[model samples]
Target: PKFFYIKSELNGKVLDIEGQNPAPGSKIITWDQKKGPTAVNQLWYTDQQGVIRSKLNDFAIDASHEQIETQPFDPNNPKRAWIVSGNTIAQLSDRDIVLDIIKSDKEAGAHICAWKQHGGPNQKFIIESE
Candidate 1:
């Protein structure tokens, strides 16, 4: 199973797209992993090619507007490059910037963003492969 869920270390929720949208620019959120037809929205995996991809389609996670969102991956775009190091997923351009759950909010729909790495639980995650 190549697809997996990147569950929040702070809340135990999985990464999901707003409206289950696979289109580029769709906001990323932390939500309950309701496995069903739209379940893939919360499933993901890295191709080991630098970008983290959504099982919803060919869309991959991208850094944008201080927030993380889904986008059709451009293999040549450096902005889409990422790396999973231990419990942290960081932008390749800067390891100090890692995926962050804003305010450490555990509620469904809480937004995610890129921020300076810290010891906060919101900064850690588990890649649960299916």
Candidate 2:
């Protein structure tokens, strides 16, 4: 419950000073979540200090009609800007976390959200490196 994990959902984006989402595909993985980041069989990012970074490129909803995951974007929604960092992208979120995405989107947009140790867009993340 002390540490949590988060990942970006873009192709080439960098993280913010605070580390938040400006787009979609951000994930949260933590020991507090009960199942460790690896317990679920998904990769999570970690900083030099071992803190989960806010960006990644290996994530996708397992759309199998069981979980019924839905997309977070709608054409009617407002458009936001993001920054490209190396082979990844960063999306600033409402709560503040630079989530990275593997896929770049000029139309699909980012999936960044707030930060919470419990769960939400703030907790889920994809693990990756420079």
Candidate 3:
């Protein structure tokens, strides 16, 4: 199975989306379909493991999709503490969830990375079901 890419709106998830595990109570929104309208986007969510599709497809999501577990604080390093700002944490949409990371005392605000709810960024990642 593959993750359907889509764009997001002010809402939280997607509609008419497909290829996900389809969990109820899980939110949906508009995702950038890679090349389509904003409404045609797909449904997606982030988990402790990582971001996943509602349908739970075996396909992996793109690197644009980040989980609370693998959040990057230092663009320089991949292994370190993350900067989280609950106040800045807002659900921009399914394809676009925003979480602000607090850097340090020297810094004022956090960095926002667009969350992706679908396939891996590189072509080599193969996410299979457990």
Considering every candidate listed, which one attains the maximal lDDT?
1
Candidate 3, residue 10: lDDT: 24
Off-target runs (Cα >4 Å) in candidate 3 are 1-50, 54-56, 64-130
Give the number of the best model, judged by TM-score.
1
- Give every collision pair in model 1: none
Clash statistics: count for each candidate: 0, 42, 28
Instruction: Please provide, for model 3 over 1-130, each residue's C-alpha lDDT reduced to its tens digit, 9 standing for 90 to 100.
Output: 3433322222222222332223322222222233333322242343444334333322223224332222222333322222112222223233223332212111211122333222222101112221
lDDT of each: 0.81, 0.28, 0.27
Error of 1 at 53 (Å): 0.6
lDDT of 2 at 51: 29
lDDT string, candidate 2, 18-124, tens digits: 22222343332222221333323222343342223232232232112221111233323222222232222233222232332212221223333321223333333
Local error of candidate 1 at 5, Å?
Answer: 0.3
Worst 10 residues of 2 by lDDT: 61-70
Q: Candidate 2: lDDT over CA atoms?
A: 0.28
The weakest ten consecutive residues by lDDT in model 3 span 121-130
